[PDB]
Every structure is written in C-alpha cells, then in structure tokens.
Amino acid sequence: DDWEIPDGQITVGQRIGSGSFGTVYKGKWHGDVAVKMLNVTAPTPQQLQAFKNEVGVLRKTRHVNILLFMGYSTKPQLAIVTQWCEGSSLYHHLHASEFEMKKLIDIARQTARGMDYLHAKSIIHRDLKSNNIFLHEDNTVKIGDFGGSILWMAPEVIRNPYSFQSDVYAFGIVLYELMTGQLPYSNINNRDQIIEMVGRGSLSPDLSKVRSNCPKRMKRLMAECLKKKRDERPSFPRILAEIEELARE
Amino acid sequence: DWEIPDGQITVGQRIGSGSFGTVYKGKWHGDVAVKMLNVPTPQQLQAFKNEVGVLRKTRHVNILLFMGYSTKPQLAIVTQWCEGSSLYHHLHASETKFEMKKLIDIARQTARGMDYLHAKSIIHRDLKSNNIFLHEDNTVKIGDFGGSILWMAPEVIRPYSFQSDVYAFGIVLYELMTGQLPYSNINNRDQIIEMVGRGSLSPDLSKVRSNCPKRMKRLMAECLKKKRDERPSFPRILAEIEELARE
Ligand SMILES: CC(C)(C)c1nc(-c2cccc(NS(=O)(=O)c3c(F)cccc3F)c2F)c(-c2ccnc(N)n2)s1
C-alpha cells in the first residue's frame, strides 16, 4: 500500500535525458530500473505538491502497455522509480533507423490498449508522441512520459485545452507515423507556420503518403482521429475495437 | 481501488488450475488472465482481501502483473496475459535450445523477481519451472504463489521460509543447466519423498552441461543445501549471477 523506497537501496547511474518533467537515469534496484529525479537543491512547496499528485496518478496504473511505476523516494531529491525498458522508442525505429504492416498494426493496437486503459481511469496523457512510446524488447509497447511536441498537438492545444479528445488526436498522428513512416508536415520547416496553419484549421496530415498495403479501415480511422473539431473524434473504446478487428480481418 | 465492476471482463477459454484457483484467458483493455476462485462467506471475503492485499504489493517486471479483482459475478483476480509458455515447457517439452547466455539471463531475471519478493517479505511457497512464464520468450514472469515435490526442500517434505524458496530456485537452476528434472533415474514419488526428506538424496550435479559456468555450479550447490540455514539469501544470489553475467 506504500511505495516509498527507502533511500540507499537505489543505485543511480548514467543520465539518459529529460522528458516532460524530471530527469531520468538508469538505476539499480532488485534489477534494472529507470529513475526520474527532480534535481533541485530543495523542492519548493509547489514542487512537493505536484510530486505527490503525479505519484498518486501513477500508482493507479497497472497495465502491460503502460510503463511500470515501481516506487518513489523523497530524499535527497524527489524521485520516481520505474521499470527499465530495453531498446528504443517508436520514434527511433520509425525515423532514426533502417517494420512490416502486421507489426505496425500490432504496435498501434498495444498503444490503443494502453490509452483506452488510461482513459477508463479518467487519466489524460497530455504528451503522447512516438517519442514517448518505448518498444520494450522491441515487442511490448510501453507508454510513458506523461504531462517539440507541436506535431502531435491538436488544433485547440496549439491555440486548459487538454482532454481525452486531444490524446486521441495525438494518437492519430502516431498512426500517421506508423502508416507513412514519416513525420507530418515534412514540407513545412517553420515552427510558427505549422502553429498558425494547424491552429488556423487549414493544415492537416497528408493521407496520400500512407503505404499501399495500409488497410483502408486504418486510413479511415486515422482521418477520424485527426478531426479538426474535437467532439468529432472517436473515443478509445471505438478506436481499440476497430484496430483489434481489422488486425484479424 | 482495483475492483473491476461486473460486466467489464469477457471470459474466454479455460487455461487450467494452479496452486489455487482456475485460470481463463480474458478481455479487459486487451488480453488478461482471469483466475476464478471457486466460490462468498463473510470470512471467505476476508481471506480474499488478504491475498489481494499481498498481490497489490508487487510492482516488478519479473513478477506477474496484478491488474485488479472481481467480486461479481464471482471472486476473481485479474492479471496481465503472458504470450508463450512456461520455462518448464521450453526445458522439458519443447526442447527449446537455449544458448548459455539465455539460460543465465533467465536465471538472473528469476533471481531479480525473487529478491524483490523477499525484500517485500513475501514467500512464494511454490516456485517451479512451470510457475515461471517466459512472456514473449524474453521476460521472466513469476506467478502462481502458494503434486510438485521436485522443488520441495527437505524441511518442507518432513517449514516455508525464504530458504525453501532458495532451494526451489536451486532446482530451477538445475533444470536450466541440466535440461532435465531432478532424480530422472528414479521414477518413484514415495521414494523421493522419503529420501529427499531424510537427506539421503540430492540432485545429481554430474549431469550439468560442460558449457555451464563453474560459478553457477557452486551457486546451484549452495542453493541446494539440505540444511536450511546454510543456504544463501537472494541478494547474494542475485549479485553472483549479476557478477557472472558480465561475460
Ligand atoms: C528520454 C526520456 C523521454 C527522457 C525518457 N524518460 C523515461 C522515463 C523514466 C521514468 C518515467 C517516465 N515517465 S512518467 O514519469 O510519466 C511515468 C512514471 F514515473 C511511472 C509510470 C509511468 C510513467 F509514464 C519516463 F518517460 C525513459 C525510460 C523509462 C524506462 N526505460 C527507459 N529505457 N527509458 S526515457
């Protein structure tokens, strides 16, 4: 019932980087772990409060497609311990490296399962990117890094605009990455152009870029997820149903 | 709370019965395993909460992920679904050929889970090769917490402690390196019970394969000590496997 890991048990190691919040290092604790710490000399009451809140949210997650929360510590720095994922993110595999359709579908399915699970718990991700989707042992999708993210931002977010619908839009962009192998808006290299245009309602991902073997049901689902108006986007129960179905059919 | 309301879980094919309860494959935000408990009484409900209370305390990659419990239509526990088969099936049925590196990683992962369980002061009471699920063939998943006498420590046969878990892990180590179950040339349950229980019989270490690192042979022998207090603790066990893993 209590997930406080007494300090001195955790052997922190090499730094990996910084996500939406905190900084992560590879660690040692009953095996490999990832350790996200807030490196400040002394946490301001704001930081201590937010720390308690997010931990309270993370301890409500138990699903194979959600990064495993394992525990937390408060001294000397506030820290959150998670499982260690082997391999790289979906971003690296898609954009920084040299997948067959069946794998692409399965990745989409696992991600939908995780998101569907989160939404049923009334949890909004707020920062879903292919960057946040770790392919553990290249076989299991692990969603992490909750709240450069401009590409995955819904039009209303670009202009509290966060909701289940904005998560769905981000998921739609991830589908676009899986089915095209590309990041959206390749012919636009200006950050403010995309911000203006996507926000203006003018610009949307180019669905003609999808692969030939990409199923039409997937293509339709993608277009539904990418609706400019938020209340026109599908919910994850319907999203999961469609993917899981088409994976068979 | 981790109670899953009635109707959210779709039960599929029966998988089998374990140390307690009956397992089915199911649907709930993806694939799950549903362990049906055959039943509630006021007191049965308390015992149900106590076991769920223990399971709710585990958050580790090498421990089967608890996901929730059902009170209606009947008492049930929900866990993740593992793809593939048990370590037992690979070693003794499938005859899957593992390079020494895989066998030691599996041993290392199992050690990680057991060390975690013991740090939480949880005793498994029924660790064996078919309790160890190789999820997607790579990740060890220890489940089925407490007919299976091959993994029973002498003191258990004649009781349950961290030391008896260590012994059971020693037999698993034996399986990994030998490829066989202990006492293969003796197909008599009563005999093994009598002889292992009184201390006259122990696993034949001559049957370990040549490629097996000698440090693991020693560690295996240390785990299989007939006298309970001469067995090493899992933190020590993990380190030596971890140290040997460098190669
Ligand atoms: C590169 C980048 C983006 C900085 C990373 N952050 C994490 C990481 C490490 C710890 C937590 C969270 N995400 S979180 O903080 O939102 C979170 C929890 F703290 C607990 C449970 C789920 C969860 F998403 C992370 F994304 C990474 C991470 C986590 C596990 N294994 C590996 N190999 N990397 S990589």
Ligand SMILES: CC(C)(C)c1nc(-c2cccc(NS(=O)(=O)c3c(F)cccc3F)c2F)c(-c2ccnc(N)n2)s1
């Ligand atoms: C009948 C047999 C072959 C022994 C099995 N039992 C389980 C199974 C199913 C559910 C729970 C537990 N073990 S448990 O009941 O002790 C337990 C929890 F309920 C929660 C967390 C850990 C844990 F070990 C299991 F072993 C199996 C199982 C579990 C997950 N995936 C698959 N494919 N099979 S297989």
